[PDB]
Amino acid sequence: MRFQYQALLNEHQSQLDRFSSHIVATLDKYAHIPHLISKDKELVDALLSAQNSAQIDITNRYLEQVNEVIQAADTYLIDRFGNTIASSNWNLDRSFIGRNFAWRPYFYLSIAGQKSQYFALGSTSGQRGYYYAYPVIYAAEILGVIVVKMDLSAIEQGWQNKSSYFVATDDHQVVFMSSQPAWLFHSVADLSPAQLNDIRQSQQYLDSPIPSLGWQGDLQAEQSEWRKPEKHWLQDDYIVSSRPLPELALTIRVLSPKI
Ligand SMILES: [Ca+2]
Ligand SMILES: [Ca+2]
């Protein structure tokens, strides 16, 4: 079987190439949309007359149309103070209208004039998403931020292997996407109270308890093994190959049971 270990690592490299490709192709359908619509009349006019209900009506219906064309979860416009003033979900139970997101990194970074991206557990929706944001600029001034939130299903559904698993981990090794849903919002390895407090303060996963999956291993290695404490009652160990995707601040990992 060890006569098969290198071959498995080689196959892992191909799986990571194919999945990373799928991820990039899927995100590419949404990444440029905030810039595309950012200066559109409907968005700028709303930011300039945010308390004009007829204008907000026009802008809400436009964002709803855009959101349907791109098949995103939500597309919404935020003023320069962080308040959502128009949104594709204005007519849904999860309406973001009136909610303030100045505390979210995608708003903090984009109101400073740059494009930004982020992933999180949605605070109003309760749904995970990948977020792209872009500043709305008119007459050389930043007036607000436009955001597109993408549901993660098409990415997770692209993992079709039935003999291996994948997880996408953030910088604290918290599992944000996975082919095993039970591992979502758990860390790969134990975290200290201080680390858990930092995650909680960021609100990236809201108030989610972040339990530990308890694996041990070199989480910084491209090719490694994850094991449980010796003599533990379940030794579900794995051969694990990892591929960081810096732009996304996520590392993709493929896990194959060892033996
Ligand atoms: Ca435009
Ligand atoms: Ca084993």
Cα of 18 vs centre of ligand 2, distance in Å, is 26
Binding-site entries: 36, 40, 104, 106, 123-125, 131, 149, 237, 258
Phi, psi at 255, each rounded to 5°: -120, 130
Residues paired with 144 in a beta bridge: 79, 136
Ligand of minimum distance to the alpha carbon of 239: 2
Q: What architecture (CATH level 2) is domain 28-149?
A: 2-Layer Sandwich (3.30)
Tokens of residue 36, six digits: 């595309």
Q: Do domains 2-27+153-258 and 28-149 have the same CATH topology?
A: yes
Going from the Cα of 180 to the center of ligand 2, the distance in angstroms, rounded, reads: 18
Rounded Cα distance between 96 and 82, Å, is 12
> In angstroms, rounded to a whole number, what is the distance separating the alpha carbons of residues 145 and 81?
10
How many angstroms is it from 81 CA to the middle of ligand 2? 53
Instruction: Note whether 13 and 240 are within 8 A (CB).
Output: no
CB neighbourhood size of 6 (10 A): 10
Strands (E), the chain: 74-79, 84-87, 116-121, 128-138, 141-150, 165-169, 175-178, 223-226, 238-245, 250-257
Ligand approaching nearest to the C-alpha of 137: 1
Closest ligand by atom to 32 CA: 1
**C-alpha 200: how far from its chain's center?**
17
Q: How far, in Å, are 121, 163, 175, 189 from residue 211 at the CA level?
A: 16, 25, 11, 9
Q: Report the length, in residues, of the chain.
A: 259
Homologous superfamily, domain 2-27+153-258? PAS domain (3.30.450.20)
Binding-site residues for Ca(2+): 36, 40, 237, 258
* Dist. CA 46 → ligand 1 center (Å): 15
Structure tokens at 115: 């494009």
How far apart CA 79 and CA 173 sit, in angstroms, is 33
CA dihedral 120, 117, 134, 81 (to 10 degrees): 40
Spans of all domains in the chain: 2-27+153-258, 28-149
Would you give the DSSP letter of residue 65?
H
From ligand 2's centre to the CA of 177, what distance in Å?
A: 24
Bridge partner list, 250? 245
d(CA 96, CA 75): 10
For residue 1, the ligand closest to its alpha carbon is 2
The structure's method of determination equals X-ray
What is the whole-number distance in angstroms between the Cα of residue 210 and the centre of ligand 2? 26
d(CA 203, CA 121): 8
Burial class (CB in 10 A: 0-12, 13-18, 19+), 2: exposed
Which one of the ligands is nearest to 35 CA? Answer: 1
